[PDB]
Amino acid sequence: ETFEKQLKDLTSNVKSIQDNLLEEIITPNTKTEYLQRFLIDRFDKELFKKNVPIVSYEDIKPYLDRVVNGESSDVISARTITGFLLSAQKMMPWNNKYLDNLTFIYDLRMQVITKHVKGVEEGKGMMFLFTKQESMTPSGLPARVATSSYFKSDYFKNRPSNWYYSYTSPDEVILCPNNTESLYCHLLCGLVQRDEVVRTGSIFASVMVRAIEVLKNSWEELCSNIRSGHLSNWVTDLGCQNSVSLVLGGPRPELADTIEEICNQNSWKGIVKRLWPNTKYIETVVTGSMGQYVPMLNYYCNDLPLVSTTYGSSETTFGINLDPLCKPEDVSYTFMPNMSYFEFIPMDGGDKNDVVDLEDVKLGCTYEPVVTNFAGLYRMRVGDIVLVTGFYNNAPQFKFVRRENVVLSIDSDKTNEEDLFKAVSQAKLVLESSGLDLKDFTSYADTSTFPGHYVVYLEGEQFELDEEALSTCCLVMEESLDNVYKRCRFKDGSIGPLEIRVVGTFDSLMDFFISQGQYKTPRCKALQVLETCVVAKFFSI
Ligand SMILES: Nc1ncnc2c1ncn2[C@@H]1O[C@H](COP(=O)(O)CP(=O)(O)OP(=O)(O)O)[C@@H](O)[C@H]1O
Ligand SMILES: O=C(O)c1ccccc1O
Numbered sequence: 330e331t332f333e334k335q336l337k338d339l340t341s342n343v344k345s346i347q348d349n350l351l352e353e354i355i356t357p358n359t360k361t362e363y364l365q366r367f368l369i370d371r372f373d374k375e376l377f378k379k380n381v382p383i384v385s386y387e388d389i390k391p392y393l394d395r396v397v398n399g400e401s402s403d404v405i406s407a408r409t410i411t412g413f414l415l416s417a418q419k420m421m422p423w424n425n426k427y428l429d430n431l432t433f434i435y436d437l438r439m440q441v442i443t444k445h446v447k448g449v450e451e452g453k454g455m456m457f458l459f460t461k462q463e464s465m466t467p468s469g470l471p472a473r474v475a476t477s478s479y480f481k482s483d484y485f486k487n488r489p490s491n492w493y494y495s496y497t498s499p500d501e502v503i504l505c506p507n508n509t510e511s512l513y514c515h516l517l518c519g520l521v522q523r524d525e526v527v528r529t530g531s532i533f534a535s536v537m538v539r540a541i542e543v544l545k546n547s548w549e550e551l552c553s554n555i556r557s558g559h560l561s562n563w564v565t566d567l568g569c570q571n572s573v574s575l576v577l578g579g580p581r582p583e584l585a586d587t588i589e590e591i592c593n594q595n596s597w598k599g600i601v602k603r604l605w606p607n608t609k610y611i612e613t614v615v616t617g618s619m620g621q622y623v624p625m626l627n628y629y630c631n632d633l634p635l636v637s638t639t640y641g642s643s644e645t646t647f648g649i650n651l652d653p654l655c656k657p658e659d660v661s662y663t664f665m666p667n668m669s670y671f672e673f674i675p676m677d678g679g680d681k682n683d684v685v686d687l688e689d690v691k692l693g694c695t696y697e698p699v700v701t702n703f704a705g706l707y708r709m710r711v712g713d714i715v716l717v718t719g720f721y722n723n724a725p726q727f728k729f730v731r732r733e734n735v736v737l738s739i740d741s742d743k744t745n746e747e748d749l750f751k752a753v754s755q756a757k758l759v760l761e762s763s764g765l766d767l768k769d770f771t772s773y774a775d776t777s778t779f780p781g782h783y784v785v786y787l788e789g790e791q792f793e794l795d796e797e798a799l800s801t802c803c804l805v806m807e808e809s810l811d812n813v814y815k816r817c818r819f820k821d822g823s824i825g826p827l828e829i830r831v832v833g834t835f836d837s838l839m840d841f842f843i844s845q846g847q848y849k850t851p852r853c854k855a856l857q858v859l860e861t862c863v864v865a866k867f868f869s870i
C-alpha cells in the first residue's frame with residue numbers, strides 16, 4: 330500500500346525533484362575549486378548548462394588525483410570525500426550519500442520483489458556476497474569496490490532485520506576478504522540450512538556461475554564438513570572459522586548422506602533446484618553482456634526466474650527494474666530522480682538536441698547518460714547507451730543496450746577496445762623476430778566452459794607449427810590487460826589461460842561485412858565460417 334504510493338510520488342514530479350536535487354548539489358559547491366573555474370557563483374540551471382563542460386574521466390582525473398593524494402575535497406566537493414570507489418583502474422570520489430542512495434534502492438527493490446514473488450518472506454537468501462579488500466591512498470582514505478564500501482559500513486552492519494536482509498551466511502563470511510575461502514563457506518552454510526533457502530544470486534551472473542562451478546568441484550568436501558561438523562582446515566580466516574562452526578554445530582551424517590545423493594545423479598541439470606527446492610528465483614543481473622550466462626543458469630536452475638533488479642555504477646545507482654520477473658531482453662530500468670541529476674546525450678537522429686534532461690528524453694531514442702552527483706562529479710559521461718522504452722508516470726524506463734566502448738568482458742574485467750589493441754600490436758613484435766608477420770586480429774568471449782576467457786583469431790631455407798615463439802604471445806597479451814582483469818584471471822579464479830586460434834581469412838571476412846550490410850576492423854552465424862578456418866590452438870602459462 331505505502332509502496333505503490335511511494336513509487337507513485339517518486340515517479341511523478343520528476344522535473345521538480347531533479348531541479349531541487351540539482352539545487353542541493355550546486356549550492357554548497359560554489360565553494361569548490363572546480364565549479365569556481367567555470368564561473369558558477371550562484372545556483373542557476375541555465376548558467377550551469379552553459380558553463381560546466383560535459384566531461385569524461387580523463388578530463389577531470391587531474392582534479393580527482395589531487396584529492397586522492399591528499400588535497401582538500403573542496404577542490405571538487407564541499408561534502409567531504411570520505412573514501413573512493415574502484416571501477417589502469419580508476420577512482421571515483423565517494424561519501425555516505427552513495428550509501429544513503431544505495432540503501433534507498435535496496436529498500437525499493439525488496440518491496441518490488443515481495444510484491445511479485447510468493448513466499449519469499451518465509452526464508453533466507455543464499456547470497457554470494459563478497460568483500461574485496463581496500464587499496465589505500467596517500468590521502469589516507471580507502472579505495473573500495475561499490476558493494477565493499479557498503480559491507481564495511483554500518484549500513485550493512487546495522488541493516489534492517491527482515492527476510493530480504495537475512496542470509497544463510499554469517500556476516501563474517503560475507504566480510505571475509507579471501508573470496509576463495511568465503512565462496513566455499515557460502516556453499517557450506519547454504520547447504521546446512523538448505524530447506525530455508527527461498528532465493529539465491531549475486532550482484533552479477535558470472536559470480537552465480539562460478540559459485541555453481543565451485544559447488545560441482547567441491548561438493549564431496551562440503552559434505553565431509555557437514556558429516557564431521559568440522560570446517561576444512563585450509564580456511565584460515567578466523568571469522569569464517571568461528572561463525573561457520575556455530576552453523577555446522579555438530580556432526581550431520583544424515584544430512585551429508587542426503588546431499589551426497591542429490592549430487593551423485595548423472596546430470597547436473599536443475600542441480601540448484603534439487604539442493605535448494607524452495608528457491609523461488611535467482612537474484613542476479615543478466616542484462617548487458619551478462620545475458621550470455623542465461624542459458625547456463627537456466628540449465629542449472631531449471632528455468633527459475635532470473636531477476637535483474639538494479640542498474641548502477643561508481644558514478645551513481647541509476648534505478649531499478651519494476652517488472653522483475655520479466656525476461657532479460659525485455660528488462661527496463663526506471664531511473665530514480667532522487668539519486669543524481671541525470672542528463673542524456675542523444676546517440677541517434679531521434680533527438681537532434683545537444684543534450685537533454687530526464688523528463689525530456691524521447692520514446693524510442695538512444696542516449697548516453699550524464700551524471701552529476703553528491704561527491705564531486707559534474708556532468709560526467711557514464712559510457713553506457715540506453716534506449717527509452719516507456720514511462721512509469723513521468724519517470725522514463727531504459728533498456729540497457731551496450732557499453733559505449735568495449736570489445737570483451739568475461740567477469741568484473743573491462744577490457745576496452747584500446748587495451749585490446751594493446752595485444753594485437755604488443756606481442757606481434759616477437760613473432761616478427763623469428764620469421765613471422767601478423768595478418769589480422771579480432772576477439773570473442775567464450776562461455777563454452779567455466780571459466781570463460783578471451784578468444785582471439787590471429788594470422789623456406791619448416792614442416793609443423795611453432796609453439797615456444799607464439800605461446801609467449803598469449804601470455805604477453807595478458808600482461809597488457811587491466812588490473813580488474815588479471816585479478817579475475819587468477820585470484821577470483823574466474824578465467825583460464827588466454828589463447829589464440831591461427832586461421833588471408835580477413836580479406837575473406839571483410840566480404841562477410843558487406844555481405845550483411847569504407848570499413849575498419851571490429852572490436853568484438855559469423856563464427857560458423859570463421860570457426861572452420863583454423864588449424865591449431867595454443868595455451869599461455
Ligand atoms: N544492471 C546492469 N545491467 C547492465 N549493465 C550493468 C548493470 N549494472 C552495472 N552495469 C554495468 O557496470 C557499469 C558500472 O560499473 P562500475 O562499478 O563503474 C565498474 P566499470 O564498468 O569497469 O566502469 P568503467 O568502464 O567506466 O571504467 C555500468 O556502466 C554498466 O555498464
Ligand atoms: O546490488 C547492488 O548493490 C548493485 C550495485 C551496483 C550496480 C548494480 C547492483 O545490483
Ligand SMILES: [Mg+2]
Pocket residue numbers: 710711712
Ligand atoms: Mg564510466
